[PDB]
């Protein structure tokens, strides 16, 4: 048996952010997602922000996987918002999540 409901709000006219490093790893990333998922739902605006060392020995496309990582927990709740793209000159990306404005919904109560 199932029974709770908060009700219907959009939310008002909010926005968060979040900022870390490459260096997180699965156990720490695991929260970090969980955090924005959470505000996904409200339809709130996340705008993440990923650091990276002095000029890492590492590519762009890695620095894309962290990205993918986080929407790969609300592929069905969330979307790229805002495609990423490397901001300060590359050294970091910006990106956004939003939700599906398409009727796709893998998480609640059939709905219908």
Same mark, same amino acid.
């Given at each position: %048996?199932?029974?709770? =409901?908060? %009700?219907? #709000?959009?939310?008002?006219?909010?926005?968060?952010?979040?900022?870390?490093?490459? /260096?997180?790893?699965?156990?720490?990333?695991?929260?970090? =997602? #969980?955090?924005?998922?959470?505000?996904?739902?409200?339809?709130?605006?996340?705008?993440?922000t990923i650091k990276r060392r002095?000029?890492?020995? +590492?590519?762009?496309? *890695? &620095?894309?996987?962290?990205? /993918?990582?986080?929407? +790969?927990?609300?592929?069905?709740?969330? &979307?790229?918002?805002? @495609?990423? #793209?490397?901001?300060? $000159? $590359?050294?970091?990306?910006?990106?956004?999540? @939003?939700?599906?404005?398409? #009727?796709? *919904?893998?998480?609640?109560?059939? =709905?219908?």
């Amino acid at each position: %048996g199932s029974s709770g =409901s908060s %009700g219907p #709000k959009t939310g008002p006219t909010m926005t968060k952010e979040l900022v870390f490093s490459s /260096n997180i790893g699965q156990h720490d990333l695991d929260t970090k =997602s #969980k955090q924005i998922q959470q505000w996904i739902e409200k339809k709130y605006h996340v705008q993440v922000t990923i650091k990276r060392r002095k000029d890492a020995e +590492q590519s762009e496309e *890695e &620095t894309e996987e962290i990205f /993918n990582q986080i929407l +790969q927990t609300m592929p069905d709740i969330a &979307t790229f918002s805002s @495609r990423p #793209k490397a901001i300060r $000159g $590359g050294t970091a990306s910006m990106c956004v999540f @939003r939700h599906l404005s398409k #009727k796709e *919904e893998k998480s609640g109560p059939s =709905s219908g």
